[PDB]
Motif scaffolding. Structure first.
Motif, PDB file in Angstrom:
ATOM      1  N   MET F   9     -70.710  43.200  -9.223  1.00 18.35           N
ATOM      2  CA  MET F   9     -70.326  42.162 -10.143  1.00 18.35           C
ATOM      3  C   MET F   9     -69.099  42.567 -10.934  1.00 18.35           C
ATOM      4  N   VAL F  10     -68.186  41.662 -10.994  1.00 17.74           N
ATOM      5  CA  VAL F  10     -66.928  41.880 -11.650  1.00 17.74           C
ATOM      6  C   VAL F  10     -66.871  41.096 -12.947  1.00 17.74           C
ATOM      7  N   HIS F  11     -66.103  41.632 -13.876  1.00 13.66           N
ATOM      8  CA  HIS F  11     -65.829  40.941 -15.112  1.00 13.66           C
ATOM      9  C   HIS F  11     -65.034  39.667 -14.828  1.00 13.66           C
ATOM     10  N   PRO F  12     -65.414  38.529 -15.421  1.00 15.97           N
ATOM     11  CA  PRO F  12     -64.782  37.261 -15.027  1.00 15.97           C
ATOM     12  C   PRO F  12     -63.285  37.238 -15.251  1.00 15.97           C
ATOM     13  N   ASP F  13     -62.787  37.874 -16.308  1.00 16.17           N
ATOM     14  CA  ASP F  13     -61.353  37.863 -16.557  1.00 16.17           C
ATOM     15  C   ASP F  13     -60.577  38.539 -15.445  1.00 16.17           C
ATOM     16  N   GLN F  14     -61.236  39.391 -14.670  1.00 16.34           N
ATOM     17  CA  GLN F  14     -60.614  40.090 -13.560  1.00 16.34           C
ATOM     18  C   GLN F  14     -60.857  39.382 -12.235  1.00 16.34           C
ATOM     19  N   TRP F  42     -69.342  35.444  -3.670  1.00 15.21           N
ATOM     20  CA  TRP F  42     -70.108  34.493  -4.413  1.00 15.21           C
ATOM     21  C   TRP F  42     -69.322  33.784  -5.486  1.00 15.21           C
ATOM     22  N   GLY F  43     -68.412  34.482  -6.129  1.00 14.98           N
ATOM     23  CA  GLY F  43     -67.570  33.827  -7.092  1.00 14.98           C
ATOM     24  C   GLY F  43     -68.123  33.927  -8.494  1.00 14.98           C
ATOM     25  N   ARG F  44     -67.533  33.129  -9.376  1.00 10.34           N
ATOM     26  CA  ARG F  44     -67.979  33.085 -10.757  1.00 10.34           C
ATOM     27  C   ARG F  44     -69.373  32.484 -10.847  1.00 10.34           C
ATOM     28  N   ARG F  45     -70.184  33.033 -11.747  1.00 15.41           N
ATOM     29  CA  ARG F  45     -71.588  32.680 -11.810  1.00 15.41           C
ATOM     30  C   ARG F  45     -72.119  32.908 -13.212  1.00 15.41           C
ATOM     31  N   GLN F  46     -72.902  31.944 -13.680  1.00 10.88           N
ATOM     32  CA  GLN F  46     -73.566  32.051 -14.966  1.00 10.88           C
ATOM     33  C   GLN F  46     -74.677  33.094 -14.915  1.00 10.88           C
ATOM     34  N   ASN F  52     -73.280  42.955 -21.552  1.00  7.57           N
ATOM     35  CA  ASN F  52     -72.046  43.401 -22.180  1.00  7.57           C
ATOM     36  C   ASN F  52     -71.349  42.233 -22.866  1.00  7.57           C
ATOM     37  N   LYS F  53     -72.153  41.350 -23.446  1.00  6.56           N
ATOM     38  CA  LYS F  53     -71.768  40.281 -24.348  1.00  6.56           C
ATOM     39  C   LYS F  53     -71.195  39.073 -23.623  1.00  6.56           C
ATOM     40  N   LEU F  54     -70.913  39.153 -22.333  1.00  2.84           N
ATOM     41  CA  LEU F  54     -70.316  38.031 -21.631  1.00  2.84           C
ATOM     42  C   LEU F  54     -71.379  37.292 -20.838  1.00  2.84           C
ATOM     43  N   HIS F  55     -71.141  35.997 -20.646  1.00  2.00           N
ATOM     44  CA  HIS F  55     -72.152  35.102 -20.109  1.00  2.00           C
ATOM     45  C   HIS F  55     -71.945  34.748 -18.642  1.00  2.00           C
ATOM     46  N   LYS F  56     -70.715  34.810 -18.137  1.00  2.00           N
ATOM     47  CA  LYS F  56     -70.444  34.617 -16.722  1.00  2.00           C
ATOM     48  C   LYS F  56     -69.898  35.895 -16.108  1.00  2.00           C
ATOM     49  N   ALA F  57     -69.940  35.949 -14.781  1.00  2.00           N
ATOM     50  CA  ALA F  57     -69.446  37.120 -14.074  1.00  2.00           C
ATOM     51  C   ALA F  57     -69.310  36.788 -12.595  1.00  2.00           C
ATOM     52  N   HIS F  58     -68.545  37.605 -11.879  1.00  2.00           N
ATOM     53  CA  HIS F  58     -68.134  37.288 -10.518  1.00  2.00           C
ATOM     54  C   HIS F  58     -68.951  38.125  -9.531  1.00  2.00           C
ATOM     55  N   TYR F  59     -69.786  37.455  -8.745  1.00  2.00           N
ATOM     56  CA  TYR F  59     -70.680  38.112  -7.804  1.00  2.00           C
ATOM     57  C   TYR F  59     -69.977  38.306  -6.461  1.00  2.00           C
ATOM     58  N   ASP F  82     -63.972  49.953 -14.511  1.00  2.00           N
ATOM     59  CA  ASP F  82     -64.451  49.154 -15.627  1.00  2.00           C
ATOM     60  C   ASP F  82     -64.514  47.675 -15.300  1.00  2.00           C
ATOM     61  N   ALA F  83     -63.854  47.250 -14.226  1.00  2.32           N
ATOM     62  CA  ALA F  83     -63.913  45.850 -13.842  1.00  2.32           C
ATOM     63  C   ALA F  83     -65.334  45.453 -13.460  1.00  2.32           C
ATOM     64  N   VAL F  84     -65.940  46.224 -12.566  1.00  3.10           N
ATOM     65  CA  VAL F  84     -67.293  45.961 -12.102  1.00  3.10           C
ATOM     66  C   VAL F  84     -68.264  46.377 -13.203  1.00  3.10           C
ATOM     67  N   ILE F  85     -69.001  45.413 -13.758  1.00  2.58           N
ATOM     68  CA  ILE F  85     -69.950  45.755 -14.809  1.00  2.58           C
ATOM     69  C   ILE F  85     -71.258  46.348 -14.223  1.00  2.58           C
ATOM     70  N   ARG F  86     -71.711  45.783 -13.087  1.00  2.00           N
ATOM     71  CA  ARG F  86     -72.940  46.179 -12.445  1.00  2.00           C
ATOM     72  C   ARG F  86     -72.722  46.283 -10.948  1.00  2.00           C
ATOM     73  N   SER F  87     -73.564  47.075 -10.303  1.00  2.00           N
ATOM     74  CA  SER F  87     -73.568  47.171  -8.861  1.00  2.00           C
ATOM     75  C   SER F  87     -75.002  47.360  -8.405  1.00  2.00           C
TER      76      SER F  87
END
Lengths: 70, 88, 66, 259, 117, 104
Positions: F9-14, F42-46, F52-59, F82-87
């Motif tokens: 999962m990537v940070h949406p801004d990236q 997968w793309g942007r996803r709620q 980490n305080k953000l509500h959407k992220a890129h799967y 730091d782009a990928v918040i989770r894996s």
RNA sequence: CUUGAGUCUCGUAGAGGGGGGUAGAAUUCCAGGUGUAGCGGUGAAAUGCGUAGAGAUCUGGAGGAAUACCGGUGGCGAAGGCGGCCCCCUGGACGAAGACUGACGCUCAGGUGCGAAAGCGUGGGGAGCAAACAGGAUUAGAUACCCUGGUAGUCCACGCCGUAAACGAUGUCGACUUGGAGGUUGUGCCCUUGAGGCGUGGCUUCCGGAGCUAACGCGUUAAGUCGACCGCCUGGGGAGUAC
């Protein structure tokens, strides 16, 4: 148990819905169980004893039921 | 556990038919290779007692196999323990 | 009356969130096998899938948290 | 000899499990128990209420034959599950007959929409319907003479849940329960459901494709606590109930009956 | 003081004492009241009646904020759980959400020991 | 060698960067003669809850038959990136190539 | 020689073990906002914390420990014991057919290893809980039970300790003897015409027959009918103590 009052819904009904939701959750019971610490042995013992009681209630009373009371 | 290909190999070398797989010597070898493999593991993981229990069992079984071989046929046992390098 | 047996799935997928949502609570809880009538073997893996989803933020751990 | 073995397989060949083969001859009547013998291990303790037709008096004397139902054996002594359920298979066959010619023609009189759809009754039983089916168009039988006689023209059936909606007027015109459990949901969709077992806190009316409802003890009537469900409704009877509440998650649809 | 239309009621319901705290939607508390403060002590403040009157007091307190809508969060086990919210209703706010907000750990900290009585 | 199943999962801004990273990842897998059986942006996803305080992220989902060493390398990259918040690298028995229930 | 014992082939389920990562909730503390007089606690209190702004409430941070639901007279393990996910290394069990070895087996004094909790050593850590301790109650007294605090310890690493109602108070291995209701995990066939039908293996809970038993009870997982090996008992105390 998050709940929202529907449009033109009575208050009392809403309260009832909430109570039902809470019951379903088992929140109060959850709290009660976590008030103080239960020893693992005690937990095991309770679970086992409860199961034994359940089994008794299921089978022995059924057997009794077969025969009439009067 | 031992990898299938490695099992097949060891069987091929020590087994006469290469289909046998149950020959005493073959068996001994399989055990020995496993014991060797697990040595590194247990060098790493000294408290892994449960796994070590298996290791010990395998050793004991190997041991019994060696004894059986000895009483049955001494030479073959000698050749086996030269191949594997078992002090006894 | 287990679904998985009838469907005949080899393994539950944590990605298939809709299937999962049927077995979770409104409060987020995993639903017992007594209520769902899921088979034991299938229940365990279902729980595993749910939790994997929760880690992935596909499912919520609970309704309240934010 | 093999006489007996051949007979055993013969008698297998000349009976089946469900209530299909009309075989049980009524060999004793007394009120309030009818009894038969369909070549089973024992005789059935039949209620009188499986066998009175549409106005409240009995119809079959000694020697008469109706099949009953099976696949449940010996709760401690006895044999059957009741015969009207057998009648349900005949009703299902009649409903299926429509498919052949795309039109099943009976009498269907639907006064009012229980759960959105007018209730249509075929000779003895009365079934519940979805809204559209009562009327082919917006005709709305509320302005028709009450309990009027036309027919039933099928608009909708649920195909696992016995909900069948039929078109009374206009002769010229011619897992599985729990994912999408939003059909009878909204707040108050009433249903026609047979009760199964009354657990002294409940009644367990549950009809609609492998679900479970509880009308437990609090509503049931307009007395709260002194009620004892077994006294107040029935055993095995199709009733007024509606949802009032659904869990799709912990599969507890909590119906009611005080409505 | 600034008037606010919509806000919260937090109901901390303990076994021994109920605490009602009205706040704005952001988190900033406007007023509060207690069963212990309503003049209830020991046996008497651990009761639904004590809780409802505490709720009434709190409602009275935030009159000058002219709050109309309210959502409620109920915390803890206690008698003043249903009674409190009923009292609040009576006080004449549009109750919008009722939420249960008990802190349930997912088996975190060890609780204290069982009492021997 | 071993069929892994990665979802990171990537940070949406990236989000605009996401392709390059994917490519980079792919390249490494190919380097060690590792196959790549399915790959689904997968793309942007709620998010079900805000990490980490953000509500959407890129799967991004990812299916690999690769050696453990490269998998470890990828994990390290992810942890430091730091782009990928989770894996979630997750073993699997088979190459599963048919794709995911909601891409459908 | 192949029945016992073991190997090979393919699968299966698992809180089995060791290592390393990570997630969320909740408690505690810190910093700050809002806000105002109580909070807390009990049978009832009081000690205690609070106008030097507590409790409540919201924002941000720190850190430790444990893993709600799933979860089950469910599972795994020789026993002790094992429960959030992931990965790495790893032991066992079971089934399916075949193929192989060809009695290689069972038991085991000494011996060797593993062995809850508490406890010890050295070095770390320390949120919560809490022996000791302190205060408040209760009481005739209260070196307790209850309340408010609270340190060793609990946590981690590496050593030692070697005991528990370490219990099924039932040594291990093998064979044989009527049944029923389940659970779990395989697997063969069958139109899976459906959640099913008929079998066949492993482990497992309850009831109960013959038989056994002082009785209670055990009862194909024996405490029945037998064989092999070991361990142990010989009135109560003194004493599992002294030397």
């Amino acid at each position: 148990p998050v709940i929202k009052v529907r449009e033109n819904e009575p208050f009392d009904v809403a309260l009832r819905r909430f109570k039902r939701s809470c019951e379903k959750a088992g929140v109060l019971a959850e709290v009660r169980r976590r008030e103080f610490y239960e020893k693992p042995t005690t937990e095991r013992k309770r679970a086992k004893a409860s199961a034994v009681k359940r089994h008794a209630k299921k089978l022995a009373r059924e057997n009794a039921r077969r025969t009439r009371l009067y | 556990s031992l990898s299938t290909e490695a099992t097949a190999k060891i069987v091929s070398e020590f087994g006469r038919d290469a289909n046998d797989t149950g020959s005493t010597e073959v068996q001994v070898a399989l055990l020995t290779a496993q014991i060797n493999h697990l040595q590194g593991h247990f060098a790493e993981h000294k408290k892994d007692h449960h796994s070590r229990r298996g290791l010990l069992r395998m050793v004991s079984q190997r041991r019994k196999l060696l004894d059986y071989l000895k009483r049955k046929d001494v030479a073959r046992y000698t050749q086996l323990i030269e191949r594997l390098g078992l002090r006894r | 009356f287990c679904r998985f047996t009838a469907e005949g799935v080899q393994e539950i997928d944590y990605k298939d969130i809709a299937t999962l949502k049927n077995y979770i609570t409104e409060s987020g809880k995993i639903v017992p096998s007594r209520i769902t009538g899921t088979r034991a073997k299938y229940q365990r893996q279902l729980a595993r899938a749910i939790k994997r989803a929760r880690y992935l933020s596909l499912l919520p751990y609970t309704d309240r948290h934010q | 000899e093999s006489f007996a073995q051949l007979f055993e397989e013969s008698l297998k060949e000349i009976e089946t499990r469900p209530g299909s083969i009309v075989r049980g001859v009524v060999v004793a009547i007394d009120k309030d128990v009818v009894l038969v013998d369909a070549g089973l291990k024992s005789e059935s303790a039949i209620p009188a209420e499986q066998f009175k037709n549409a106005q409240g008096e009995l119809e079959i004397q000694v020697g008469d034959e109706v099949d009953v139902a099976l696949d449940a054996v010996e709760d401690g002594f006895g044999e059957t599950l009741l015969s009207r359920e057998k009648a349900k298979r005949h009703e299902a066959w009649i409903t299926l007959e429509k498919a052949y010619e795309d039109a099943e023609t009976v009498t269907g009189v639907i006064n009012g929409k229980v759960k959105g759809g007018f209730t249509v009754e075929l000779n003895g039983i009365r079934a519940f319907l979805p809204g559209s089916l009562v009327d082919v168009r917006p005709v709305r039988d509320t302005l028709h003479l009450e309990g009027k006689e036309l027919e039933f023209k099928v608009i909708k059936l649920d195909q696992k849940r016995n909900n069948v909606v039929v078109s009374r007027r206009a002769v010229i015109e011619s897992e599985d329960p729990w994912v999408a459990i939003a059909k009878r949901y909204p707040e108050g969709t009433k249903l026609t459901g047979r009760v199964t077992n009354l657990t002294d806190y409940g009644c367990f009316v549950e009809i609609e494709e492998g679900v479970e409802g509880l009308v437990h003890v609090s509503e049931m009537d307009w007395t709260n606590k002194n009620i004892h469900p077994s006294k107040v409704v029935n055993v095995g009877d199709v009733v007024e109930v509606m949802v009032l509440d659904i869990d799709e998650e912990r599969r507890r649809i909590s119906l009611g009956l005080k409505q | 003081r600034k008037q606010v239309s919509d806000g919260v009621a937090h109901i901390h319901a303990s076994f021994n004492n109920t605490i009602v705290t009205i706040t704005d939607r952001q988190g900033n508390a406007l007023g509060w009241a207690t069963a212990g403060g309503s003049g209830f002590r020991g046996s008497r403040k651990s009761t639904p009646f004590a809780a409802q009157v505490a709720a009434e007091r709190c409602a009275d307190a935030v009159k000058e904020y002219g709050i109309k809508n309210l959502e409620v969060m109920v915390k803890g086990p206690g008698p003043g759980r249903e009674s409190t919210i009923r009292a609040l209703n009576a006080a004449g706010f549009r109750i919008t959400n009722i939420t249960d907000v008990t802190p349930i750990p997912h088996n975190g900290c060890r609780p204290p020991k069982k009492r021997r009585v | 060698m071993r069929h892994y199943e990665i979802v990171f999962m990537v940070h949406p801004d990236q989000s605009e960067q996401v392709p390059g990273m994917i490519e980079r990842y792919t390249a490494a897998i190919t380097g060690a003669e590792g196959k790549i059986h399915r790959l689904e942006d997968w793309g942007r996803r709620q998010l079900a809850y805000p990490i980490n305080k953000l509500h959407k992220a890129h799967y991004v989902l990812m299916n690999v038959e690769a050696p453990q060493e490269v998998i470890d390398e990828l994990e390290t990259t992810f942890r430091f990136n730091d782009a990928v918040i989770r894996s979630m690298v997750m073993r699997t028995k088979h190459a599963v190539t048919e794709a995911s229930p909601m891409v459908k």
